[PDB]
Each structure stands twice: as structure tokens, then as C-alpha cells.
Amino acid sequence: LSGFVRPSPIIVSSPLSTFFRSSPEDSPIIPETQVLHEETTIPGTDLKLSYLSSRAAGYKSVLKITMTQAVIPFNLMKVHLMVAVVGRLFQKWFPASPNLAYTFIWDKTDAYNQKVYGLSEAVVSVGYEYESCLDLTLWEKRTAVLQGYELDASNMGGWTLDKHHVLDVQNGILYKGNGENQFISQQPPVVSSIMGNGRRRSISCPSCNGQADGNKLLAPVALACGIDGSLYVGDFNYVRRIFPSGNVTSVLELPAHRYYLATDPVTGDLYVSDTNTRRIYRPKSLTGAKDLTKNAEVVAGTGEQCLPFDEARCGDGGKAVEATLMSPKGMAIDKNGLIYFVDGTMIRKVDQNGIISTLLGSNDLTSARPLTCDTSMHISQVRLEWPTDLAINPMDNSIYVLDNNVVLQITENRQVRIAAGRPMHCHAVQTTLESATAIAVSYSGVLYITETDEKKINRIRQVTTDGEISLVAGIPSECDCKNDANCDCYQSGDGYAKDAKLNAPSSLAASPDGTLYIADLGNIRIRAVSKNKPLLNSMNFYEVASPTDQELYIFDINGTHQYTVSLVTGDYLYNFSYSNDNDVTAVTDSNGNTLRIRRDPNRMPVRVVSPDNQVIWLTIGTNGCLKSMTAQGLELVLFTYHGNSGLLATKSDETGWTTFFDYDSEGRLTNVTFPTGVVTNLHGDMDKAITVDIESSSREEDVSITSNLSSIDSFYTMVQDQLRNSYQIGYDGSLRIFYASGLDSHYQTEPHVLAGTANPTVAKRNMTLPGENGQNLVEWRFRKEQAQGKVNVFGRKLRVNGRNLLSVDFDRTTKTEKIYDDHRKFLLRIAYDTSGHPTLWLPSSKLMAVNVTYSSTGQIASIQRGTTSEKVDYDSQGRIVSRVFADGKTWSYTYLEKSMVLLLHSQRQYIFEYDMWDRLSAITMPSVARHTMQTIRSIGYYRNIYNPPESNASIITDYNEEGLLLQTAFLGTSRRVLFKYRRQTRLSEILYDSTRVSFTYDETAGVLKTVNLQSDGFICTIRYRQIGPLIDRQIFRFSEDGMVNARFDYSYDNSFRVTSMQGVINETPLPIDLYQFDDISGKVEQFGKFGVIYYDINQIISTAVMTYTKHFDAHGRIKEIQYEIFRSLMYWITIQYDNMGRVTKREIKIGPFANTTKYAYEYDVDGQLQTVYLNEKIMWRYNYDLNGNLHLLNPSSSARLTPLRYDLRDRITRLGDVQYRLDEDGFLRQRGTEIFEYSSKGLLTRVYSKGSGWTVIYRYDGLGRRVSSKTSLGQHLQFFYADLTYPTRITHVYNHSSSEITSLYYDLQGHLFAMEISSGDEFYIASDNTGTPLAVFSSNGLMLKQIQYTAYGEIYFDSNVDFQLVIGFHGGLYDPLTKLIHFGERDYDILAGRWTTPDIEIWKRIGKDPAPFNLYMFRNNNPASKIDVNSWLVTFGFHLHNAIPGFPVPKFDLTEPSYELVKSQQWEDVPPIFGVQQQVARQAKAFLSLGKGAEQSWLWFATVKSLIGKGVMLAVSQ
Ligand SMILES: *[C@@H]1O[C@H](CO)[C@@H](O)[C@H](O)[C@H]1NC(C)=O
Ligand SMILES: *[C@@H]1O[C@H](CO)[C@@H](O)[C@H](O)[C@H]1NC(C)=O
């Protein structure tokens, strides 16, 4: 019976529900499983709720069973498909057909109408039928996991509370409440040593029958499974029955020593393959007879050795007892009861009677054939080579025989197929195997091949039912265990099976609960690679942790949630009381925030009691599910469904954002309709990979998403028509990424030291640029100090590329902390509150002790850095009421009915309206200037409508549903900026009335290719070049006459540190830069030509002659900028601070031997510079109007009282004699004879003068930056920005009139200190705290220029007006002709004393924390001071932007970048679109985390009851 090939099933399962939004305020759609994830919020507490449609009843798991790729053989016509589930048994007959398929839609339901829960393994039985032998039918059975019903956490009508948790201790699933379903059983398995240690024991065996957990062993060479869980151990002379208890007895007394064992499933008897005595045994008393030798019933062989090779018999045909045998080997026994023993070199059969027969023998020299590498062959025409082991699959009644590293399976069709392994004659069938010394197979069909050459390979690679290999046990070791016998081959006891280091595994055995038993003779133990189980402590809890929130959870006996523990400090956070049916009813935070909740007699929540004593009422549906959350007055959120499916059909807010949802019968979200009109279309389909196709109906960005779900990883795929993103996700969480840019990061997993093996932790990040030196390696080292049951000192160290950076050694002795470095430079002791909050910061080396206590309602109470401090109070709602300071100042947050009135100490009222979510609705000044505000829902986009008082000139920012900006518009002059988006869901095309800035993205990589402004004959194109995502060459090409071209070249060294900069500007190359850094600490050793030495806070940016030191204060800020050239005193200022930190006394001794100059800053109670002293006289005053309007002042050099006047909108009208003109839409239109042209970006473009007759034009790029300034008088400049760490910090200035280039050098903070001209000149600048140039020196130390600045930094004293400087007051670009400081985005006026461009995003920054503000206020009217988070690494110098990538650089600058400029250095970390990007966002945020009302997607202002009402859909499909 041969020539009949085995069938080919094509089966797929459904993917699992482990993909949800990280910060759930952004994305509702995860098209992995098309599961809707929706957040909602309870008032008073940041605790949330969650929706997850995997909990829905209609979420039916799909098991797509297709049968053929139309290659049906000619003699096959019928298909008998059968499906075996938990008690549901489906059958359906088919006549055969090309590409005939079937979809089984499982109800997650037993046939006895039972809600199954947790994991389930349904068995698929694909059966075919031949035309040749109609009696013989095919059977190829597999398994397939299926998700059951998820366990009800809180019985919220299907909804899920956020920080609630429930543990499925039966199936091994942690159902989190945020949306995660941590599958404990799907993790990599746990090694647990269960018998003795590596020491030996002699032959006589004292203490031979008691308990065996530290019992010494002789040589365990064989193991065996059991239906009683009995582990029959072959300890070289003794068979020992390990009971399912502590006690372990002994049974029998006895290469050829290594006998093998067996176990009947249907009976409890024990079988011995004694090779030495040529017999098969069976004991009588397993508990123990008198003698251990005579407890052995012989089965076959009789000791006498049979014939070697003869085909007649060894005693065959007759009785099995009377026959003789030659060299028996390992064996098994059928579920029927047929024992099959290896003897000699062939398989020999014994039935229920004593009869030795043979199914497959050997010595068949008619078929001494090569190994049939493709198909099956005849039952008696197979040669065999060293079987030596046997195990049977009870699912298929298989026979797995280890034929020379190749397991050749034998099924009931009397055929021989390769199941695993490939010999020398020619997936697991693809690979070759070495030193296969034992086999086993579980009850799911998975094979287990141990491989031990005893030289760096002591491992077990499994083979599943498909024929694919996977390393599941045995780490590849480095130390040899043969030669180095004194090598600790035992490592990581109770670690991971991927991590555990074995030493010659001998035998395997598969218990029915999956606990695979490893016999290890090197370290003489019995390890058990079992399923992952949550631990049980001494108090019988479940200490399950997850450092995605840095938390430890503990559970009760049944596994429900009791406390929540912060994982590092071990201090308790939550208290969860229950009802009598163990359902959650109250929380209690460490500050007593008691979100209590009562239930129906049917255990259904109705009211919700908030910690700010607010009741929140709920309802129920006809399907027993929640419909609507209600608070006082307003119905907050409305939800309706699709009948009794439990699927969310409609989501309504309190506004009218009524989204609809559509589904199939299988529970797949195919259409999400947003009330702007933008819908999405999802083509769900199943193939070789599970494919979904999202179709945004406002774009052309159809994303194809396939899913290669393997038994190794879950290798997903994101495709946008050329760009392929694909992520490796391990079962532990080994998170490896294939971008299209060549960047291949790899996250690794480790067990937590406090938690155990039920917890994967990211500790090491591996990251791969496409290139040579693109190998970052940042690593943690977790370590505790254990003392008497509890953790005392938990330490951790961040390490990049080998060496220590930060020694975070937390202590629990007095709840202190010690963040430090090994070189004794850094020190920061942080004492903690008893409720788990950092209270007192104690740094050292002339620093200040910041102790910060906290409110009893939870929030902050008072910060105090020594003398500088402030105290606040609070209502019952946590609202701050008064804000007193340390200078006697005090603020009054005097609330009203849902509106706030800030009162200063000088009677200025800020009337703020609010929404229920506390957005900005209307803002009233101390005058009657009412800023009424809207947020509406239009066709395709939101509109944030701001309205100035008595104005139709509205500024309106338009947004998508993701929250990307679309359209800003100034409705005064009807100017507007359009954004067009291309395939990589990013900004492509700017458009404002003449100008087009076409971005484009690369096809293979996906980086920003071009930045190409086209406005006029002026062509402004910018092209890039990278190593992966990090730039190497940027190209500046122009096309007009005078303007020049530039191009820069970078270099990296074994990190993401920009090492050497070299560019060429107008065909003139520059000498290279040397940014010599310090990766021992994160410092900066040298840069350019300048050397930086630290003295414990201090800086000395010195050269061999030019020294620039700074002596910081006791408060962490700048205090004394001393500055000597040729080691002689040339410049030193000192600044002493008040109890507010503001600058008070400024003794600027500028000049070598000349007269000193000093100041004094008399502020007011409003906290602003009102009057300024010179050295011995008052010389300035500054009055202010009701709205912070500077309306009387002293000028630069004159002593007049120049009046100023203002209108409703705080638009400036007059400075003394000259009249200003700030127009209808906020742009500065006329200053005297000068009339401006602002652009639609809010950017100054052209300045022309009618009277004085001189024009200034500012050509800008597409990034909103300043490129070139051309005056009509002859000064013609052009800028170039060689920095990418600070992409607005300018570096090189081209001068058309002199054909010379000025290179720049800034300090560590950002202050200017040096200028080198590329025509061969050098300057040594010295700057103040504000960052502005005061003294200009040559290389000879001569004062070439001295400027005395006023309170707003316009010149009233100069030593030379010829040598001008572009960079002026507070580091911005100063122009002496147009009298305007150009910062990064806006333009400050030295004459007006305020801004010119009104901010739009100031309302986002003032809606959170209110303050004395204005639409044009400069530095909160504090024009000489710079700055609490109370501790920073940059203060003691650890500038870890260079060491650790993905970390935000401290932005100690005022020049803000543009919106399109932020998007440019954003390489591929977009706001996320798909759910696998939502998992890499957690493991990049929680890894980078070094320390210990809410909002929406840029919905700034208060909501409007718009035209699309609450309960109606508006849809636009392209
Ligand atoms: C919870 O555990 C208790 C004992 O620990 C047990 O009696 C009870 O049946 C379990 N289940 C529920 C739902 O209370
Ligand atoms: C989903 O949307 C597409 C296109 O609008 C439509 O053809 C399809 O019928 C919709 N499906 C459901 C279930 O509403």
C-alpha cells in the first residue's frame, strides 16, 4: 500500500486581541482584529474606562478553512471536512471544486450552550477521499487556538474600567483593564528544578524513600510521563516513582547502562526497556515490595539473545513471553494498548495478547533505497537507521521514530512521511539536525528534539504540527561543559527556557498538563519546562507585575484584584474593596481618592461616587449592557448597539460628534464614519496571511496590512503602495522592527527581579542603522538587595555601549533614593513621601534643598528652593484658590459658577468662561475685551474659531480627525495657508496665495526627500541625504542671481552623536569641526576649537588665551560670567537674584581699566520690570495699562515721558510722535514711512519705505525660516543653518557686499561667545545672561565695540557703528534699519516693546495654567531674566541627548521653530495610524523613562452645538 501521497490543508486562525492605543485619546481604530478601542473619563479622577469589542458577544472567532489552490489531483473528488471543538462537532461534506473554501464562524460557545473562557484549542480534521482506493481516506489533523469570551472584569455592561484587573488563573491570561490581554500561557516557558542538586550520591542509597527536593542523585538517564503525573526516573539502578506530592519512593533494582522507560496512558503500569538484561519488564508493586530485584515481571526476551538479522523470527508468531530478543531500546504503547518496542534495529509489535508481530521491520534488501525526501513509501519496504526512541501522538495515532536525526512519522495509512529533519541524502524538514539523542511529543502534536553535542549546544528545538522548528529550551552556551568540567553549566535557575543553560539533556517526557521534564546529567537535576504560571507567595497571592506602568499587582485566591503596588518602591497605591460576590465597588488611592461605585441587586452599577463627591448616573439596555453615562445636567456620552450583538454601533459625545460604526456577522469593524464626513473602508479577507485594507475616504493612502502569524513570532506587515513596515513581535515581547528606512531596532526581554518569570521587561535596546557605525547599545542592570522577606535596596544602572552612566540605587530603609555616578561628581538624594511622592531633593556641592510637600487631596502644596518658595490652597475639587509667593505677592483664583476670575494684588480681573471639560469658551480682560471662541464640525475638518473683540477677522485652525493641522487663515485680509497630504500621512504641499512648498518622500527609505518652495522666479529647493533616518548631507540650491548655494557634510562615531561638521558655502569649503564628547557622563569635552572643563557646577569654556568662565549660584542658575583675555581682566558681570529668581543687581565692569557700570532692577508687586537704575541714578520707568499695555516709558537716550495709546484689541497705535498700524488681522501694517508686507504664515516678507526711501525684502524658505535679507541701501545678507540638534540656531551668515562668511559658535546654554569670519578673521564675544552681545573683542583683546543696552535692548551707547552684528537682543536676529528683532517665528519690536505677530497656540498654553498674559507680551514683561522641575541632569552637566537617542534635548532658547519644521526632523515616529505602532510607542516611552480636565486631539476651544446635531451621521466618501 504505497503511492498515495498525503493531503495539503491550508488553515488560518484569527489573530489575538493584544493591540490597543497607548495614550487612548488619539486613535480609536486598530485594524489588527478590527477591534474598536474607546476611552472615556470619570470626572475628578484620571481613572478612565475602556471599550474593547473583543469582549462583545458578536465578536465571533473565524477559522478560515480553504482546501485547494485548484491543484486537486485527478483521483480525488470528495471532501469529508470535520471540526472538533470543546464539544461542538461540525461536519460538512463537499464535492471537490477548484478553489473551494469554507469559513467556520465559531460562536465561542460549547454545544451545551456554555460560555467558554480563556484559551481553547479546537482540532481541525481535514479529510479527503480517493477514487483509487475508496475505502482508504485521508486524515491530516491540526490544531488552532481560538479566543473564548474574555472574563467579565467589573460588569460595566460590557465596558471595562481602566486600572481594574482580572486574572484567568485557569487558562493563564491576565485580562488588563486598559485594553491589554497579557496571555501568561503564551509566554516563553519556565524552568523549575524539582529534584536535587548537582552533587552525587553512592550506590547503596540511604534515605531512599522519603521526599526528594534536595535529594542527591546518581545518574538520571531516563524519564517517563504518566496519567497520574508520576515521573518515573531512571537513576542508573533505581526506578523512582515521584508522586504528585512531596514523597518519592523507589521501585526497581538493577549505553547499555542507559535503559529507557515507557508509560501506558490507559493503565497505570510501568514499562522498562532494559537493554543490558535483554528483557522487557513490568513491576508488581509501584509503592514497593520487599526486594527491588524480584519486583519485575518479564514480558519478552528471556535474557537470551536472538538472531541478528534473519527475516524468519527471533521467536515471532508464537508467544511474546517465550521469544528472545537482541539489544532492546526505547519504546511506547498505543492508546489501543499495543506496545511497540525497538529491538535490534527495527520496530517490533506486540498486541493485547502475548504475540510478537511486525508492522515495519528491517533487512529488506529489495528496498535498500535512499531516504525518500518528498513523499511516502511502502509499509514493508523501508530501511531503518538507529531508531533508539519512540513517542506517539494520540491525536492521529501517529508513530514518531527517531531515524538518524530525522523523525520519520508512521500514521494509520501504513505510510512513512518525513515529519521533521532532513538527512545527508538531501521549515523543520528543510533544516538538518545534530546529536538528536531523545524525542517526545505532547498532546497537541508538538515534537521535542533535544540536541546535545555537549560542546556549546545543549538545547531542545521543538517541531510543531506544521513541520517548522523553533528553539524553545536550551540557550546556546559559550562555555564548554566537556573539557571545562569545572565550569558552572548551571545558570539562571527559575529563569526563562530560552535563557536557561543546559548540560547534556538525556530524556524527555510530556505530561498531560504540558510540563516537559528534562533529565540533565551535567548538573544532576530534573528541570521542568512547564507552562507559565502566575506565582503564589507565602501569603497565597498572585504577584503579577508589568513595568509598562512600573507596577506590581497582587491578587486574591480566585485571582481578582486587591491592591496595586508601585514596583520600584514597594509602597502601596490602591485599595479595592468588594461586594460579597467579589465584584469591585470602591477604590482608595494613597491620598484617599475614593472612586466608589454601588450596584444593583442584579450586580449592575447605577451611580458612580467620585472622590470630589460627584455622582455619575448610568443606565442599562435591553441586552443587559450600558447605553449612556450621565452626570449632573448634561448627558456626557451616548452609546447604542446592533441589537443583541454587544457591538458598539453609535458613539455620541456631549456635543454632537455622533460617529456610526458598521460590522459584519463575524465581528469586524469595516466602516467608521466621522461626522466631519471622512469615513473609512476596511476590506477584511483571509489568505496565506490575514489581510486588511483600510481606505481613508479623504486621502488615497490605502494601507495593505498582512499578518504572517508563525509559531516563532507574529511578523506583521504595513504597506503603503511602496513603503513596507513590518514588526517582529515575540511571545515574550521581543520587539524588533523592519522600517523601510533601513532602521532595524530590536528590543529584548528580561524577567523582573522582584516579579519573576511571569513578567517580560525591556532592559536592552539594540538598534541598527543601514551603515557602518549604526550600532547603539543601551542597557539596564536590575538588582535588588534582599533582606528578610522584603526588598531593601533596589538598584538599577543605565549603560550605553559598555559603561555606566547613572547609578539609580533606590533604598527602602528610610524610603530615600540616591541617584549618582561612580565618579563622585553627581549626587542627588531624594527623600520620598509615605504616599509614594518625591518630597525633598538634596543635591550637593553648593546647591539648595528643595522640599516639596503635597496636598491632602493628592496634588502639590508648596515648592521651596531654600528662600524662593510659593504656597497654594485648594477646594474640594482640587482647584487652586490662592497662589501666594515668597516675595509677598499673592494671586486669587476667585472662581464663579463654572468660570474663573483671576485677581492679582493690583485688581486685574481675568474672566474666563469654561466648558464641562474645562476648555476655553470666552476670555474677558480687565477691560471689556471679550475673546469669544468656538469649535465647530464642518465638511471634512474641524474649525477652531477665535474671535477678537468687535471683529469678523477670525483666525481659524483646521484639523483632521487624527489631529494634523490643515488650514490656518487670517480672515481680515482673507489670506490663508493650505496643506496637502501625500501617501505617508504627513505634510507635503504648503499653499498660500503664490507659494507652493512641495515636499516629497523617498520610495525605498521613506525619509524627507525634497523641500522645494516655488513662489516666483525665485526657486527655493532643499534636498537631504541620510544614514537611515539621521541626516548626513543637506543641499541648498537656489536659482536667482545674487543668492548662493550651500551644502553640508556630517560624520558619526558609534552613536547618534554629530561628530564632525564640514560644509561648503558658495563653492568655499570650511575647516572641519571637532565635537569631542564625553560618553562616560554625557558631557561635552570640546567643540569647534574651544575646550570645556567642568568644576562641579561650573564651566570654563577656555582656549590657550581666551577664557570664558561661569560661576553658577546656589540655586542652579547663572550668577557670575567672568571673562579674561591674555589672563587679564576684560569683562565680568555679577547677577544676584531676589526671592523670585529675577535679576536684581548687575555690576557690568566692561572694559579693561575703564569705569565700572552697574544696575538695579526695581520690580513691582505685579512682577515686572517697572523702573531701572543706572549706577547712581534712576534712569528708566515703565507704566502699564489695564491689559498689560506699556503706555508710558523713558526712551533710549532722552529723558522724556513718551506716551503710548492702545485700542480694544491691545493693538499698538502710537509711540510718542510716530503712529503705528497693527491692522484688522493683527499684522503690523505701517510704522511711520515704513509699510510692511507680512505673509500668510504670519511672517514678515517685504518692508518698503515711502518717505525715507529704502526697501528691505526677506526671502524665506518653505520651513518658515529666514534665508536672505536684502536692503536697498546695499546690505545684502543670506543665512545658512548648519545645526540639526538645534535646527533654528543659525551658524553661518553670507554677506553679498563683501563676499565673506561669518561662522558662529555658541556656548553650552546657547549664548553667543565667538565669531570667526571665513575670510580669515576672529572675534571673542562676551555675552550676558539674556544671550545678547555686549562686548566685541579681537584676538588681541582690544575692545572693538561696546554696547550698553536698555531694559528692552535697544542701543543708547555705541563705540563703533560700522561693525554691526546680525544677532542682537536675546539672541534673535537684529536689524538696525527695520528696528525689528526677528526671533524664530515672531518678530519683536525694540521701539514698541511688544510683539508684532499675535500668537495662536498661546491659548493652548494658557488654557492649562492661567497667568498674567497678553497677546503681545514679551517674556511676561520680565526682559532680563531666564530660568520648577527641581532637579535636572543638565545642571550637573549630564547632557544625555548625545548618549541616549530618542531623548528630548533641553530647549534653552526663545527662538521657536515652525510647525512644518517640527515635522521635518520627525523622521518616521508619526502620530500613530495602526495598532502595532501603538505597542512600539509604549516600549520606547517606558524604556526612555528615567525618573519615577484632560484633553483631546487638538480640540482647543469649547464645543459648539453645531448644525450636525446629536444623533445624525454625515458622511463623505471621496
Ligand atoms: C472565591 O474564593 C472563595 C474561597 O477563596 C470561594 O469559596 C468562591 O467560590 C470563589 N468564587 C467566588 C465567585 O466568590
Ligand atoms: C462599508 O462601506 C462601503 C462603502 O461605503 C459599503 O459598500 C459597505 O456596504 C459598507 N458595509 C457596511 C457593513 O456598512
Ligand SMILES: *[C@@H]1O[C@H](CO)[C@@H](O)[C@H](O)[C@H]1NC(C)=O
Ligand atoms: C544587535 O543587532 C545586530 C544586527 O541587528 C547584531 O549584529 C548585534 O550582534 C546585536 N547586538 C546585541 C548586543 O544584541
Ligand SMILES: *[C@@H]1O[C@H](CO)[C@@H](O)[C@H](O)[C@H]1NC(C)=O
Ligand atoms: C523644608 O526643610 C526645612 C529644613 O530643610 C524644614 O525646616 C521645613 O519644615 C521643610 N518643609 C517642608 C514643607 O518639608
Ligand SMILES: *[C@@H]1O[C@H](CO)[C@@H](O)[C@H](O)[C@H]1NC(C)=O
Ligand atoms: C557686510 O559687508 C559690508 C561691507 O562694508 C560691511 O559694512 C558689513 O558690516 C558686513 N555685514 C556683516 C554682517 O558682516
